[PDB]
Each structure stands twice: as structure tokens, then as C-alpha cells.
Amino acid sequence: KSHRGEYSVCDSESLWVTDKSSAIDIRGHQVTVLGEIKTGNSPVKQYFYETRCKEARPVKNGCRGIDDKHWNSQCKTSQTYVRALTSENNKLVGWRWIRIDTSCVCALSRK
Amino acid sequence: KSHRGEYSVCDSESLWVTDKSSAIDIRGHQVTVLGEIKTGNSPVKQYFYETRCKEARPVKNGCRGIDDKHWNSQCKTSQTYVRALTSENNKLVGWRWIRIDTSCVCALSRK
Amino acid sequence: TCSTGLYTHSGECCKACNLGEGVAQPCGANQTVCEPCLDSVTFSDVVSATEPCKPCTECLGLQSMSAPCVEADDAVCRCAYGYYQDEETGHCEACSVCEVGSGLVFSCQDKQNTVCEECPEGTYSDEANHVDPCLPCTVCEDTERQLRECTPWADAECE
Amino acid sequence: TCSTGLYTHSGECCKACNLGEGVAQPCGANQTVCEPCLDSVTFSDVVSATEPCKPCTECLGLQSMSAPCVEADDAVCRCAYGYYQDEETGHCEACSVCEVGSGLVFSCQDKQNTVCEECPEGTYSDEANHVDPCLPCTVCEDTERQLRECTPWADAECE
Ligand SMILES: *[C@@H]1O[C@H](CO)[C@@H](O)[C@H](O)[C@H]1NC(C)=O
Numbered sequence: 001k002s003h004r005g006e007y008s009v010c011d012s013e014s015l016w017v018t019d020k021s022s023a024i025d026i027r028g029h030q031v032t033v034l035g036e037i038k039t040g041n042s043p044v045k046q047y048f049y050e051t052r053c054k055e056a057r058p059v060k061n062g063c064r065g066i067d068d069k070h071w072n073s074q075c076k077t078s079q080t081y082v083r084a085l086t087s088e089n090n091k092l093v094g095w096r097w098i099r100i101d102t103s104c105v106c107a108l109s110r111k
Numbered sequence: 112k113s114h115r116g117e118y119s120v121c122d123s124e125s126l127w128v129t130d131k132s133s134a135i136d137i138r139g140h141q142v143t144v145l146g147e148i149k150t151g152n153s154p155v156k157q158y159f160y161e162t163r164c165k166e167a168r169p170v171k172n173g174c175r176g177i178d179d180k181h182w183n184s185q186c187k188t189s190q191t192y193v194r195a196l197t198s199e200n201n202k203l204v205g206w207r208w209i210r211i212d213t214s215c216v217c218a219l220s221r222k
Numbered sequence: 223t224c225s226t227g228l229y230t231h232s233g234e235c236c237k238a239c240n241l242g243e244g245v246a247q248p249c250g251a252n253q254t255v256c257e258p259c260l261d262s263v264t265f266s267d268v269v270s271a272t273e274p275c276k277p278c279t280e281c282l283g284l285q286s287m288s289a290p291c292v293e294a295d296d297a298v299c300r301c302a303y304g305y306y307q308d309e310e311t312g313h314c315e316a317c318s319v320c321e322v323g324s325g326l327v328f329s330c331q332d333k334q335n336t337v338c339e340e341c342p343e344g345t346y347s348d349e350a351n352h353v354d355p356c357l358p359c360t361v362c363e364d365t366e367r368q369l370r371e372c373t374p375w376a377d378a379e380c381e
Numbered sequence: 382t383c384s385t386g387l388y389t390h391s392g393e394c395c396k397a398c399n400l401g402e403g404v405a406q407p408c409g410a411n412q413t414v415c416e417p418c419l420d421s422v423t424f425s426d427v428v429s430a431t432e433p434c435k436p437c438t439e440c441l442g443l444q445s446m447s448a449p450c451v452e453a454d455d456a457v458c459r460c461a462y463g464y465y466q467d468e469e470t471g472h473c474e475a476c477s478v479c480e481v482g483s484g485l486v487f488s489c490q491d492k493q494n495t496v497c498e499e500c501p502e503g504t505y506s507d508e509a510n511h512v513d514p515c516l517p518c519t520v521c522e523d524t525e526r527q528l529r530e531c532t533p534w535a536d537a538e539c540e
């Protein structure tokens with residue numbers, strides 16, 4: 001996870017998400033997410049390793065360590081793209097790039 | 112993501128990585144990353160969507176918006192786990208969770 | 223069936239190749255053969271009985287790929303980092319910088335050039351780039367004594 | 382071949398089911414039959430001519446999963462967020478908190494309990510948790526007059 005001497009500005013948590021049934025792909029459409037992947041022999045279960053913010057405001061005003069005198073701040077969960085075996089209206093099964101939660105980052109705004 | 116009246120503390124960049132051949136899996140072993148994935152059968156190419164820090168120091172001291180008077184700071188690329196078709200010493204083809212670069216986050220330390 | 227005829231697009235006879243497939247052999251005397259397009263080399267975004275799989279387009283130059291050429295879609299290229307797609311032409315200029323004394327408001331990204339402001343008071347910007355907002359002036363505690371007062375182009379200096 | 386015999390583990394005769402596979406039928410009369418273990422439900426982390434695929438272990442209670450059960454490896458459980466594996470016992474206590482006036486040094490890790498410090502001067506901690514370091518005191522600029530001076534347990538407060 002992390003190390004010693006330092007702290008995060010924003011805190012995250014991770015989880016294995018096993019029941020995702022629809023996501024938005026890179027073309028911005030809505031796609032169904034298959035629950036497994038057919039291999040030669042045994043099918044493999046399709047699930048995802050996701051990570052998100054513990055909270056929007058770790059300390060009083062927002063992100064840890066920010067000059068809160070001069071900025072508002074917030075921990076926002078960000079998404080990234082991962083490949084997934086998917087179908088669209090049950091009809092074009094294949095791999096597509098989808099958005100999932102992957103980190104927690106700090107966003108600033110001026111006071 | 113995008114932006115409106117807000118700025119990131121750390122700046123990141125994305126890219127498609129098409130030539131990754133080996134990685135460290137979740138059990139901490141070194142594995143080989145296959146170039147493709149057998150399907151019904153047109154094979155789909157294996158490649159990855161990665162994101163890392165643009166730099167370590169967006170502004171003078173480290174991350175944007177930190178009270179640099181009282182904290183050191185630094186933008187660090189962080190990794191997360193993604194599934195890949197892989198083999199170990201050429202022998203056990205199958206899916207395994209691997210570490211790839213996925214975001215850019217700020218790490219604090221006290222002066 | 224279609225003995226030697228070709229009665230075409232929706233015209234039932236000859237089969238079309240659906241999305242993700244292109245024609246390998248046309249309606250000859252025999253009927254149409256489809257073959258799957260090759261992920262990230264070839265795509266077919268059309269349902270057609272004459273169209274072969276098409277080669278993936280390459281994002282070159284001042285462009286980056288933001289969506290990969292896949293079996294049913296060409297790649298989507300977008301103008302790369304540091305550039306925007308200037309409508310009032312085809313091409314893509316470098317993102318303007320917020321000069322010294324000025325800093326970011328709206329980032330430079332799509333059809334949209336950097337939008338800068340001149341730093342308001344108690345802020346400064348001492349670089350010229352398209353990614354830093356105006357930064358707040360260092361104020362100085364009783365304990366230290368500042369040389370330089372803060373100016374829109376440079377932070378106060380202290381000790 | 383092994384007509385009715387069974388000469389076993391590395392003794393060549395009977396075949397062994399490799400990693401990721403389990404025995405469906407042993408050396409009975411016939412040769413041993415392997416079937417593949419089912420990703421995330423069953424696993425076999427052993428080469429054997431007797432062992433069926435084993436059921437995936439469940440991380441329960443004070444435990445989370447940190448590596449999914451896969452065809453050749455049981456799940457790996459670790460102590461959940463907010464707990465650590467306490468050597469001197471089997472299980473896992475709650476991470477100690479850095480009380481008011483104290484803040485984080487080393488995070489509450491795996492076998493490692495929170496390590497705190499009492500806040501050094503010009504820093505405070507007005508909360509009791511296991512994730513905040515001591516924060517620096519708000520100083521009050523020439524303009525403002527603070528009431529409360531900073532204390533290890535509470536920031537200076539200002540107008
Ligand atoms: C025309 O179609 C049939 C059916 O697919 C094929 O087997 C045959 O070989 C084709 N014509 C010839 C004689 O090559």
C-alpha cells in the first residue's frame with residue numbers, strides 16, 4: 001500500500017467488484033458486462049479491482065496538507081479505462097474499454 | 112477528467128501501452144504478458160491503458176496548492192491491479208492480476 | 223440462395239457482412255463470404271455486402287489516439303497534449319500560454335484554447351505555461367522580514 | 382498404463398493432476414482423470430494423483446481479500462482496514478488511535494500497529510484517529526487578531 005515518513009493528501013480504499021453488470025464504454029455507450037469469460041476449457045470469472053476515496057474531506061477543509069487559507073480542496077474519485085468482455089443489447093459480444101474507479105485525487109478551487 | 116473552475120494538485124498523462132511483455136503479478140512473481148487473446152477466433156490484441164504523472168514537481172516545491180511552508184510534497188505515479196492473459200516461465204497460461212500505472216497522487220512529508 | 227444474381231444491400235438475396243466483418247469473397251456466382259476484422263488492424267463499421275474490412279487509421283503528428291481502432295470502429299484521434307482543435311481552420315495550434323503575471327482559468331483541451339487572467343492582488347505567476355493558475359503570495363510572519371513585496375510576476379521573498 | 386495398480390506420486394504409473402487441476406476419478410481400475418478447477422470457486426495448488434480441487438477460502442470477519450482465489454491459489458486474506466495482525470495472538474485488534482494532542486508517524490499496517498507522536502510545537506491534532514498526522518498551526522497575519530493561541534490539542538482560532 002504505502003510507506004513511512006510520508007502521508008497521503010487524500011485517502012483511498014480498494015475492493016473486488018464481482019457483480020458489475022453494466023458500464024459506460026469509451027465511445028460513451030452503455031454496455032452490458034458479462035459475468036464470465038469463455039476460455040478453451042474452464043470459464044474465468046470477470047470481476048474488477050476498483051479503488052475510490054474514503055471521504056471527500058480527510059481533514060477539516062478538504063485534502064490533507066493544502067493551504068486551506070487560500071484554496072478549497074476535495075478528494076475526488078477518478079476513473080480510468082479497463083478492458084471488459086461486453087455486449088450491447090445482448091448482440092455484439094467482445095472486448096471493449098470501460099470506465100471504472102481507479103484512484104482518489106485532490107482537486108483545488110480558489111477561495 | 113475535465114475541469115471548470117478547478118485545478119489538480121498533480122498533473123497526469125495517459126497512453127496506450129502495446130508492447131508490455133512482462134509484469135509483477137499480485138503474488139509478487141514475475142510473469143510474461145501475452146501479446147494477444149485467443150477468442151471464438153479472431154484474436155484480440157492485449158494492450159493497456161496507463162496513466163502516470165506528467166512530472167514530480169508541477170510548481171516549485173512539489174504539488175500544486177500545498178502549504179510548502181510546512182510540508183514537502185511530490186507527485187507520485189501510483190499503480191493498481193488489472194487482469195492479464197499471462198504465463199509463467201512459458202508454462203501456465205491464464206489470467207492473473209498485475210500491477211500497472213493508473214494515476215498520479217500527491218504524497219506529503221513534514222519539513 | 224442467389225444462383226448468379228446479386229440483388230443487393232437490403233435486397234434479400236446476397237448476405238451482407240455485419241459490423242466487425244468485411245467481405246472476403248463477393249457474391250460471385252456463389253454467395254458472399256464474410257470474415258472477421260482483425261482487432262486493432264482492421265475494422266468494419268458498416269453493414270455491407272461489398273465492403274472489405276478497412277485498415278485502422280493512424281493518429282499522426284499533432285494528434286493522439288483517445289480511442290483504439292477496434293473491430294467495429296476506427297480509432298478516434300484527438301489533438302495531442304499542448305494543442306487544441308482550432309475550428310477556424312482544420313488544424314491544431316499550440317495551446318497559448320498564460321504569460322508571467324497571468325495564470326490559468328480554463329484549461330486548453332478540445333476546441334478550446336487556454337483561457338488566462340491577469341493575477342489578482344495577493345497572487346502571482348512567475349512562469350509562462352498553460353497549466354498553472356495564479357498562486358497566492360507568501361505572507362511573512364513577524365519572525366522573518368521580507369525583502370521583495372509580492373508582485374503579479376513574482377512572489378514576495380522572505381527571511 | 383496402470384492395469385489395476387497405482388504406483389503413485391512420482392512413481393510413474395498413475396498421472397498426477399497438475400496445478401490448477403484436481404482429480405475427478407482416481408486410479409481405480411483405469412488411469413486417473415483430471416478436471417480443471419473453476420476460477421474463483423475451486424483451486425488446486427498442489428501436484429497430486431489423489432487431491433480434488435479444493436474450495437476457495439473465504440476471507441471473513443475482521444478480514445478482507447487481498448488476492449482472489451484463482452485456479453492454482455487460494456485467496457489470500459489480510460486483516461481489514463483499521464486492524465492489524467497482532468503477533469502475540471491469532472487475530473487482529475483495532476488499530477490504536479493517536480489521541481487528541483497526538484498524531485500519526487507510521488500507519489497501522491499489517492502486523493504493525495499505529496505509531497503516534499505527541500505533537501511538536503507549532504503543530505496540533507484536535508482529533509483521535511489513526512490516520513492524521515499533527516497539522517501545522519494557523520499563524521495569524523498582521524491584519525487578524527486571534528483569540529486562541531495554538532495548543533497541541535487545538536488550532537489557534539482567528540478573526
Ligand atoms: C461455390 O460454393 C460452394 C459452397 O460453398 C463451394 O464449396 C464450391 O467449391 C464453390 N465453387 C467452386 C466449384 O469452387
Ligand SMILES: *[C@@H]1O[C@H](CO)[C@@H](O)[C@H](O)[C@H]1NC(C)=O
Nearest residue numbers: 384406409410411412413414
Ligand atoms: C477405462 O478407461 C477407458 C479410457 O478412457 C474408458 O473409456 C473406459 O470407459 C474405462 N472403462 C469402463 C468400462 O468404465
